[PDB]
Write a protein that binds this DNA or RNA. Structure first.
Lengths: 113, 215, 121, 114, 50
RNA sequence: UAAGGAACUCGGCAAAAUGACCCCGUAACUUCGGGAGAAGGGGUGCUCUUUAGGGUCCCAGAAGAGCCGCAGUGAA
RNA sequence: UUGGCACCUCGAUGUCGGCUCAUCGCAUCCUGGGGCUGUAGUCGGUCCCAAGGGUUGGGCUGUUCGCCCAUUAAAGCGGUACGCGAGCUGGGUUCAGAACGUCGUGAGACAGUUCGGUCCCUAUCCGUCGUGGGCGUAGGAAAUUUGAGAGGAGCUGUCCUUAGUACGAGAGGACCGGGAUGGACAUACCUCUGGUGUACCAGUUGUCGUGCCAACGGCAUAGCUGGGUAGCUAUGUGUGGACGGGAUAAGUGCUGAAAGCAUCUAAGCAUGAAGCCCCCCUCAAGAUGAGAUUUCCCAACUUCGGUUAUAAGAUCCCUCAAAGAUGAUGAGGUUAAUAGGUUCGAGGUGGAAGCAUGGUGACAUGUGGAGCUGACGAAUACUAAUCGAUCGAAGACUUAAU
């Protein structure tokens, strides 16, 4: 906080987003402009990290597509995420779940609250 | 438009109106006044002195620069102003400001998006040729005793000397650098700030000079 | 790529199974390629029942990458492995199948036949 | 770090625990200027623990003092040293310059509990 | 490397121009009467009184 | 130490990688001894239950149920 | 280049090639400007101007050379003790050992080959890269500036359109323009993606200690491991080489005679390059030719004719960081927020001690996203920047003008 950087970026903060913490399964509805046509692509995955800040806060989601792990990083207050949903909440000791980048099957499944 | 003086506050980011991400530098500009108006008859060039931040009044025993001395205190009072730190001269304007103080406000940069920013510091100590000039290190496969050393400084005998402009170690950084074609993102009254698109030279709490692009 | 010795894993139904990068095409001094970039490669592994046999120079496009690509919005995509696709003397592949998720934006009017056969884009 | 003192991280932390214990035991010690500017920030944070007075504060303060007898150095804290500054906020020490010393020319100061 | 040539006592005396020390920067203590170093305590019988 | 990986260079020099114990398993060749610790894989913490050993309190085991973390010859 | 001489050096001038780091020539490889063509167009040939920038990564070899693979707008040729060992390596060769082919009766030699093998130095003076102090610039000071001169930068591709048009039977396929996005290079920065983060958080192995259980501390590379704040950073994020003016080279000309015609030239008038001088960025009045503008201070004692201290101002000394070898330069010194602490936040970690409950037990659950927290934002004088001392002007003489 500087209080002069805030009040300059305070208008661009989005209050729509729900509260979530590293370890839970999340569904992000991203707007796509492929060519011309607006679509809503749904990315569903586990929240592996969440690095902090004000208007500059982010988070990354990890999903496995066709046997290949895909990690997608987003800014928290980007105007291209229509909505976010918390499909499940998982139990997890760490704040950055970077072990799951090397666990593949049923050793990479996170328990539930 | 007219140049302004400001302080670097920090970097941040906003979101452009179609969804873009824009790196931003926040530059506060407040207390800017026109202290002198140099003209061709009195001095050869035409320019305007502006005065940035506000210093405190004169004190009989002052052991720091916080308080104005008698010469400075007398130079501001001719414009009907308050002592000012960072006095600077802007050329390539059109002299329709007043040699008696008038506020130079951020609201004059609503018109004029592309600017250039002159900053006056970078700041690093004595540095080697790999850091200072981007040279290349020696190998470690063979038993090389050469790693971060400068290298050959000339030819043998026929030259019998080193040429002016050889690259060697010395104090690095701290110069004056201008970044050209930067773009104003948004101005802000009630905080007197300008959001410049990119990054300006200098450390935080440094002085920056914004003016309209010469290209 | 990153020193022209990179072993990439072909994501194609074309015989070749891994390739070694011989050259990053484009520019005189260019030293690294990313998603959407054309490379020259040589086949080090090939299935025993394929059409592109091991040991021959070919061309390819990068489809996945571990380092991934930033986007204008500030979002990023990173995959788990490097992967390429063997292309013809124009764009468009040499096998009839693509495997795994192709990069989201290999579409420019150029590689629409690769982003058409990919399981996910 | 905050400032190194010619000691490695381990020898420095030990020297600071030693100096802070000696200061709270005797209440005025003669040392070098550069170490008096470092014990300044380590003893004042112990009297804050002594002014809180919890049981978690005794145990979070026990891991920066040494086990010397007088009472123990942890019982003198939480007792007299913490009872006299119960309304004072900050500034629990004061350093006084004495001058250079023979053999090193190192500015020797006295530091005490205000 | 080794000096190629002997050094005059002109060159030596010039180069020792800035090799000196300065006066200790001292005041007079207004209790001891004697001299002291400013911002230090009175080394004579006395105190600081700052 | 990102991404790659010997591209460096005379030359993978130097460093990193393997390394303990208990189990499976193990090639061409051979002077029939060997090669061979070939190669290639699996296990390893603590708690509680039952349970033939051995020495004369000490030493060695089977199996089952469970707890935890990123990690179990958790360091050398 | 292979040589020829034998002029300097034998009280000693280290030999390749590469690495690192350059500088210069033009007999120009690319890009720019043109004349001729056996130049239809897209490509070419060959000559003339031109040195501003640029001029790749690997396989084989000690390789310089060379051949090959994949590119590139292009992969120029030369000089500088075949640049460069007080910068580095040392593979080769010119040490000693030992083996092969050949020559010698022999000790041993090469028309050759093969395995191996101690490369020194605390830089005086000139030179170069940074930084200060003395004096000067006819009173003493604070800031802001002009710019004589100096340095930097200077590269190029590919697509779309004009247009499938001009040209050509067709095949093919433009100049002159107009847009868009790259490669290499430079510079600034740390919001983003990453790196580090030895006085941040936690988990966990052996052993010793705080008398014991619980809780903590030392040592084992920071014992190790999973993350990580500020600062420093690239692979990350921004920008740049744009637009234009003057005089020209090769070339192209207009009027024009000497020479009634002709002729770009003798007089006169044009046009014409990535090159030359400006324009773009940085330095710069020790520029002894020492510049300019605004502001501030300016009486007492003498006959010294000069002196004095003090004024404006700046240092000593002390608290520091945006700065930094040190100093210097910046933020401050009680009429105060400069640092440390203390209160409150941001970010970091991940849910503490104690107690209660559920289990035989390892453990789990609750209070409480809790509690700890180096560098980051705000405020508060509580502690420390006390008292005080030093330096620093009275403005020379001529001449014109008023």
């Amino acid at each position: 906080n500087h209080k002069l950087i805030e009040a300059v970026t305070k208008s661009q903060l989005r209050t729509d987003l729900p509260s979530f913490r590293p370890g839970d399964t999340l569904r992000v509805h991203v707007r796509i402009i492929e060519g011309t046509r607006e679509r809503i692509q749904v990315f569903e995955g586990v929240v592996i990290k969440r690095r902090g800040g004000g208007v500059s806060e982010t988070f990354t989601v990890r999903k496995i597509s066709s046997g290949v792990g895909v990690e997608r990083t987003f800014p928290l207050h980007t105007p291209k995420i229509e909505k976010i949903e918390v499909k499940r909440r998982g139990k997890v000791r760490r704040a950055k779940l970077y072990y799951l980048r090397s666990l593949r099957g049923k050793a990479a499944r996170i328990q539930e609250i | 438009t007219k140049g302004i003086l400001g302080r670097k506050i920090g970097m941040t980011q906003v979101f452009g109106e179609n969804g873009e991400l824009i790196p931003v530098t926040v530059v506060e500009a407040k207390e800017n006044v026109v202290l002198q108006k140099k003209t061709v008859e009195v001095d050869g060039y035409n320019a305007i002195q502006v005065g940035f931040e506000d210093k405190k009044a004169y004190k009989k025993d002052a052991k720091s620069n916080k308080y104005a001395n008698k010469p400075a205190e007398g130079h501001a009072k001719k414009a009907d102003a308050a002592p000012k730190r960072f006095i600077r001269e802007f050329r390539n304007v059109d002299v329709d400001a007043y040699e008696v103080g008038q506020e130079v406000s951020v609201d004059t940069f609503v018109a004029g998006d592309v600017i250039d920013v002159t900053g006056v510091s970078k700041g690093k100590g004595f540095q080697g040729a790999i850091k200072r000039h981007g040279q290349s290190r020696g190998p470690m496969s063979h038993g090389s005793h050469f790693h971060r050393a400068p290298g050959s400084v000339g030819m043998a005998s026929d030259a019998s000397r080193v040429f002016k402009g050889q690259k060697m170690p010395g104090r690095m950084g701290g110069n004056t650098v201008t970044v050209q074609n930067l773009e104003v993102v948004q101005v802000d009254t009630e905080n007197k700030v300008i959001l410049v698109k990119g990054n300006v030279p200098g450390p935080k709490k440094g002085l920056v000079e914004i003016r309209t692009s010469i290209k | 790529m990153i020193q022209q010795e990179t072993r990439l894993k072909v994501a194609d139904n074309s015989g070749a199974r891994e390739v070694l990068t011989i050259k990053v095409l484009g520019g005189s001094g260019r030293k690294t390629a990313n998603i959407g970039d054309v490379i020259v490669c040589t086949v080090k592994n090939a299935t025993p029942g394929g059409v592109v046999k091991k040991g021959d120079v070919v061309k390819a496009v990068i489809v996945r990458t571990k380092s991934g690509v930033r986007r204008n919005d500030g979002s990023y995509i990173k995959f788990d492995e490097n992967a390429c696709v063997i292309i013809r003397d124009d764009k468009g592949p040499r096998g009839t199948r693509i495997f795994g998720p192709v990069a989201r934006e290999l579409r420019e009017g150029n590689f629409m036949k690769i982003v058409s056969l990919a399981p996910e884009v | 770090g905050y400032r190194k003192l010619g000691r490695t991280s381990d020898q420095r932390k030990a020297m600071l625990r030693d100096l802070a214990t000696s200061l709270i035991i005797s209440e005025r010690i003669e040392t070098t200027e550069a170490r008096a500017k470092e014990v300044r920030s380590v003893v004042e944070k112990l009297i804050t623990l002594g002014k809180k007075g919890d049981l978690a504060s005794r145990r979070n303060a026990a891991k920066t003092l040494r086990n010397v007898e007088i009472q123990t150095a942890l019982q003198k804290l939480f007792g007299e040293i913490a009872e006299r500054y119960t309304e004072r906020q900050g500034g629990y020490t004061r350093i006084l310059k004495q001058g250079p010393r023979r053999g090193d020319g190192a500015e020797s100061v006295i530091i005490e509990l205000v | 490397a080794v000096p190629k040539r002997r050094t005059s006592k002109t060159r030596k005396n010039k180069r020792r121009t800035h090799f000196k020390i300065s006066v200790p920067g001292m005041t007079e203590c207004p209790n001891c009467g004697e001299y002291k170093l400013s911002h230090r305590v009175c080394k004579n019988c006395g105190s600081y009184n700052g």
